[PDB]
Design a protein around this ligand. Structure first.
Ligand SMILES: COC(=O)c1cc2c3c(c(N)cc(N)c3n1)N(C)C2=O
Ligand SMILES: COC(=O)c1cc2c3c(c(N)cc(N)c3n1)N(C)C2=O
Ligand SMILES: [Mg+2]
Length: 743
């Protein structure tokens, strides 16, 4: 058994290395230590100082530079005995404080142990390098093990969820939190791998489930300045099981694709990988048939200054993506149409509108228009008229507009974004049709959202993302602190309620409240108001929240920005284009143009109502904000019907580098994630609890005769446990349940 064989890969890569005799000497030392700040203005940079004396209320300690300092005992962060360094479950620490928690993570991370428990949930620190802990042998090691039998691992929490699903016949969820780049998607994929392995069975479903990801990532992920493989859409993967616990299928709900990225990318960022994959990987006359050149020739790829990612071959990736499409079952014609659409988008991007004789735009060169039309299979004259002279109603009259250059470019971009988003939707739908063949008995849902992120310029997309991340942190807060203590108090176990000081509700209400209206509601209102501008909008927000809502800031340094205080920090948002992004317009004549496409996939994108149609609320189409919010509330409703398991991914630094665990970066994450509070609730509270009658059947007794049944439930439990003479401090008696602190 490799768990017990210290030469095994398990021991080498998942367990803390054996300390030496010098270490042993240090470990049995009577000396005592404190974590202190050499510079009190840098509260996250700590060193270890030896405690050399104490009074009744203070410690005096030597700093590393031999100088003595004094601190009140109430302000002291004592260092744990070094036998705890590297401990697998931090609820075991004697001293639960910030530098002590960070230090334990640091000791593990320096030995490449990225996973650490903090009571009931998992912490994961991104290594930014490959560590060989995800092989099939590692998988197999976790299968069937109680949590405490094996080292912390994403596989272990995965197994716990699976067994919880079986034992309680209750749906589960795996909620992976983290800022952008923290490791959410990699861990999500490890979860799916584990489940596909342990619950797997004909055998191609599991392969198809796994092969969904290169497709989704090629179309839905991109390089940002924070992550070379940033997910620009959120997703909820329901892994589905039959009554027997075998995988019977899976279904992916996707959220909120950053469609603006198709048409615009910041300096050093990339568009979606697929564009580069196609241009790099396509056959010699694939490229001739689609009129393609290199990325530098396309406006939608040549603006950021970056066409490459270190360590990535877009050609090789293209081969992997196509292979995935083969396994999932997209036909050759379907794939060809997909690439026609990607190529058509690049050509649309190359169209250059110019000022005509009047204010209205003209197209002097039709090479890009013609190439797009050719690959999309639409009529180029109809497309041209639809771009620069779309028809609208004025009352009931029919009026041709004549859009200027700017409006023309915007409309072309709107068309591009609509194409990309519908195509993305279609890919997801096609995928689901293949993975969903049977009605489920159970599910384990795995959530992989786009993570909390902050740039120089934060827009409506950042607000939606950061909102979602705030809702997810609140969900953790609700389950860990609020509901837990509600159980204690309903079971009257003598608990004094503790205010853990973590509540995101005010920020959430600020963003999505109804009465009084929050940001999104005022946004929606401005979005259906004919005279509205980005300026009437920002003014309206300041009018409602400035000096009124504690989580909002009207900045003095700007007239187009507003600040929201999130759990993870203040973010300033630029209001430019919010009305247009929220309304998400597309000229009907462009839809009519593409409805007439000769291409089987394109027509589906424009005629299939699940893809093409948009809901109404009154005389208006549903805004993006109201729809996403409907979607999110729906997700949270589903999660609330599940048993949640939390994984908190922690980014070590902001440089995407291995072996560089930065103090302030990590401590900021630990603080706003509520890690220490969670560890604390696990320790001060009563993690384990059981109805007075379902206890009889795991064991038997050690008592004067309470069998698998009894007339009594309360004293019938009292008696049986009592014999071990284990401390009644380690348990309590609820109206219906026995509670316990540590098993
Ligand atoms: C995620 O993207 C899409 O689903 C999507 C995108 C867009 C879209 C529109 C619509 N008028 C209607 C849709 N049903 C629709 N769907 N526009 C203007 C878009 O940019
Ligand atoms: C969900 O509850 C609410 O609707 C709600 C309640 C309140 C609220 C405020 C705001 N400044 C802004 C909101 N968006 C908001 N929303 N205040 C002061 C409230 O008491
Ligand atoms: Mg991601």
């Amino acid at each position: 058994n490799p768990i017990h064989d210290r030469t095994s890969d398990y021991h080498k890569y998942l367990k803390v290395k054996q300390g030496d005799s010098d270490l042993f000497k240090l470990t049995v030392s009577d000396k005592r230590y404190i974590w202190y700040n050499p510079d009190p203005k840098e509260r996250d940079s700590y060193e270890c100082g030896e405690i050399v004396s104490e009074t009744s209320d203070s410690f005096t300690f030597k700093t590393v530079d031999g100088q003595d300092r004094q601190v009140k005992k109430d302000d002291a962060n004592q260092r744990n005995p070094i036998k705890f360094d590297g401990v697998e479950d931090m609820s075991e620490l004697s001293y639960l404080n910030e530098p002590a928690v960070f230090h334990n993570l640091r000791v593990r991370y320096n030995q490449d142990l990225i996973y650490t428990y903090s009571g009931l949930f998992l912490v994961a620190v991104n290594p930014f390098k490959r560590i060989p802990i995800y092989t099939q042998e590692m998988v197999d090691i976790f299968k069937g093990r109680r949590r405490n039998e094996v080292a912390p691992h994403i596989f272990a929490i995965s197994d716990v969820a699976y067994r919880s699903m079986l034992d309680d016949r209750q749906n589960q969820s795996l909620l992976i939190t983290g800022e952008s780049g923290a490791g959410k998607t990699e861990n999500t994929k490890k979860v799916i791998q584990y489940l596909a392995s342990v619950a797997g069975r004909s055998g191609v479903l599991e392969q198809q489930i796994l092969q969904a990801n290169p497709i989704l990532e090629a179309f839905g992920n991109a390089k940002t300045t924070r992550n070379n493989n940033s997910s620009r859409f959120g997703k909820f993967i329901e892994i589905q099981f039959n009554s027997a616990g075998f995988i019977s299928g899976a279904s992916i709900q996707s959220y909120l694709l950053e469609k603006s990225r198709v048409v615009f990318q910041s300096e050093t960022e990339r568009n979606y990988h697929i564009f580069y994959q196609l241009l790099a990987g396509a056959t010699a006359e694939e490229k001739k048939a689609l009129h393609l050149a290199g990325p530098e020739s396309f406006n939608y790829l040549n603006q950021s200054g970056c066409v490459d990612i270190k360590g990535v071959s877009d050609s090789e990736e293209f081969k992997i993506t196509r292979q995935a499409m083969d396994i999932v079952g997209f036909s050759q014609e379907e794939q060809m149409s997909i690439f026609k659409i990607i190529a058509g988008i690049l050509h649309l991007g190359n169209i250059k509108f110019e000022k005509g004789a009047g204010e209205g735009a003209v197209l002097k060169d039709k090479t890009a228009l013609n190439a797009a039309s050719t690959v999309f299979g639409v009529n180029p004259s109809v497309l041209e008229k639809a771009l620069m002279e779309p028809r609208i109603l004025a009352g009931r009259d029919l009026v041709a507009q004549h859009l200027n250059v700017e409006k023309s470019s915007s409309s072309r971009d709107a068309l591009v974004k609509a194409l990309y988003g519908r195509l993305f939707l279609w890919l997801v739908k096609k995928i689901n049709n293949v993975l969903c063949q049977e009605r489920k008995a159970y599910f384990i849902g795995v959530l992989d959202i786009s993570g909390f992120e902050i740039f120089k310029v934060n827009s409506f997309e950042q607000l939606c993302i950061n909102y979602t991340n705030e809702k997810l942190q609140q969900f953790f807060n609700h389950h860990m602190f609020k509901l837990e203590q509600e159980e204690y108090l309903k079971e009257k176990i003598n608990w004094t309620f503790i205010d853990f000081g973590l509540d995101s509700q005010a920020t959430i209400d600020l963003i999505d409240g109804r009465q009084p209206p929050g940001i999104l509601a005022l946004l929606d209102e401005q979005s259906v108001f004919p005279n509205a501008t980005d300026n009437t909008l920002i003014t309206k927000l300041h009018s409602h929240f400035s000096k009124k809502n504690a989580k909002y800031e009207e900045p003095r340094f700007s007239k187009t920005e507003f600040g929201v205080t999130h759990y993870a920090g203040q973010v300033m948002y630029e209001i430019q284009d919010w009305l247009e992004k929220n309304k998400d317009p597309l000229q009907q004549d462009l839809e009519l143009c593409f409805k007439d496409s000769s291409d089987n996939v394109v027509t589906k994108l424009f005629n299939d109502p699940n893809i093409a149609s948009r809901a109404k609320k009154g005389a208006n189409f549903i805004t993006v904000a109201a729809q996403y919010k409907e979607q999110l509330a729906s997700l949270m409703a589903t999660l609330e019907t599940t048993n949640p398991h939390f994984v908190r991914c922690i980014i070590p630094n902001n440089k995407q580098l291995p072996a560089k665990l930065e103090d302030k970066v990590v401590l900021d994450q630990l603080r706003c994630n509520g890690v220490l509070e969670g560890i604390r609730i696990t320790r001060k509270g009563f993690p384990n609890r059981i109805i007075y009658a379902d206890f009889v059947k795991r064991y038997y007794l050690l008592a004067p005769n309470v069998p698998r049944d009894a007339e009594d439930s309360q004293k019938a439990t009292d008696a049986v446990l009592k014999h071990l003479n284990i401390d009644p401090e380690q348990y309590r008696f609820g109206i219906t349940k026995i509670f316990f602190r540590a098993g």
